[PDB]
């Protein structure tokens, strides 16, 4: 059923869906769940791993944010026709919740992405101390975003629950 979501978007115009987040958020797991094609890894620069899933019209692009230095945001290339922006958060890793707010804000300050629709996957809801989507919203202050269409979706990637729902939203926003 996930592939059929992106049928609505088969309009022929190439389309990037940038999916980022701190390492170990759940990005690789979500791609593999998209069941849309192979995951292909590339290293355009020392310390810059990129995972890609290209369906027909759609292109997925994933890499990690923070920790090590951003000295090279060569990412600029991929900011071409990124209509969607997915940010994956480990709803359990409360230690790095500050960093995710930093990282998200940066992506949000990226000029070429000003028009991207933003989806947040609150991932790992299945763990002991995993944040709910109401507090994750508060602690990030997505609330303050006035002119940016955005949404938060609880998920468990390892189980694939929520992913269809959140992509159903995003898919629909870009159609
Ligand atoms: N409990 C739980 N674990 C997950 C979930 N999604 C991914 N993981 C695990 O958390 C780790 C995150 O790995 P990965 O998906 O590669 O994150 P990435 O580095 O952003 O690509 C992996 O060991 C996954 O098996 C989830 O929804 N719930
Ligand atoms: Mg990864």
């Amino acid at each position: 059923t996930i592939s059929s979501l992106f049928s609505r978007l088969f309009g022929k115009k190439q389309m990037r869906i940038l999916m980022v987040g701190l390492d170990a958020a759940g990005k690789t797991t979500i791609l593999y769940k998209l069941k849309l094609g192979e995951i292909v890894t590339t290293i355009p620069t020392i310390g810059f791993n990129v995972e890609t899933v290209e369906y027909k019209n759609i292109c997925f692009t994933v890499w990690d944010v923070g920790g090590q230095d951003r000295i090279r945001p060569l990412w600029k290339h991929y900011f071409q026709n990124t209509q969607g922006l997915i940010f994956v958060v480990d709803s359990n890793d409360r230690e790095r919740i500050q960093e995710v707010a930093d990282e998200l804000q940066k992506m949000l300050l990226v000029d070429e992405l000003r028009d991207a629709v933003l989806l947040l996957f609150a991932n790992k809801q299945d763990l002991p101390n995993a944040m709910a989507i109401s507090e994750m919203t508060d602690k990030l202050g997505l609330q303050s975003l006035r002119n940016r269409t955005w949404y938060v979706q609880a998920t468990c990637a390892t189980q694939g629950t929520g992913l269809y729902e959140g992509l159903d939203w995003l898919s629909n926003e870009l159609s």
Side-chain angles (χ1 to χ4, degrees):
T1 58
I2 288 164
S3 59
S4 66
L5 296 171
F6 293 92
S7 284
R8 318 191 275 200
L9 307 191
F10 282 148
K12 129 94 175 305
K13 297 291 276 195
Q14 164 81 301
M15 166 168 305
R16 181 164 287 94
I17 290 194
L18 226 306
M19 180 166 71
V20 290
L22 296 189
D23 59 288
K27 310 188 292 296
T28 302
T29 304
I30 290 154
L31 283 178
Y32 198 64
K33 302 284 177 182
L34 307 186
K35 298 165 65 157
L36 294 187
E38 293 185 314
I39 297 156
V40 173
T41 306
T42 51
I43 297 94
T45 30
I46 313 314
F48 183 47
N49 274 41
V50 188
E51 297 173 80
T52 303
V53 170
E54 302 173 301
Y55 192 28
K56 180 134 197 204
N57 194 19
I58 305 82
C59 173
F60 285 78
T61 312
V62 183
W63 68 68
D64 303 306
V65 285
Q68 191 79 72
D69 41 294
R70 191 166 166 153
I71 310 302
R72 209 165 300 188
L74 185 268
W75 321 346
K76 48 114 85 268
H77 162 283
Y78 303 96
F79 304 165
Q80 270 164 311
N81 39 8
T82 302
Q83 337 293 186
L85 171 62
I86 311 184
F87 201 105
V88 192
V89 177
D90 186 345
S91 311
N92 187 61
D93 188 320
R94 305 182 101 112
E95 185 147 3
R96 282 192 292 170
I97 191 73
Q98 174 61 289
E99 201 165 338
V100 349
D102 284 8
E103 290 313 317
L104 180 67
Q105 187 86 124
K106 294 174 193 176
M107 291 302 312
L108 291 169
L109 302 175
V110 180
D111 195 8
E112 298 93 307
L113 290 163
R114 98 191 66 137
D115 281 304
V117 181
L118 163 69
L119 169 77
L120 253 81
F121 276 144
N123 202 28
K124 302 181 195 174
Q125 297 276 302
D126 64 289
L127 296 177
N129 279 271
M131 273 179 271
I133 71 154
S134 59
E135 75 183 286
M136 198 167 103
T137 303
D138 285 14
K139 295 195 190 297
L140 298 173
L142 317 170
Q143 226 70 313
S144 76
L145 294 173
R146 318 286 60 206
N147 309 273
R148 161 84 65 168
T149 159
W150 68 266
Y151 186 81
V152 181
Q153 172 79 219
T155 49
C156 175
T158 38
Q159 194 182 292
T161 142
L163 304 180
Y164 173 87
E165 293 83 329
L167 295 175
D168 181 22
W169 183 87
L170 172 76
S171 192
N172 179 48
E173 278 305 327
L174 297 171
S175 61

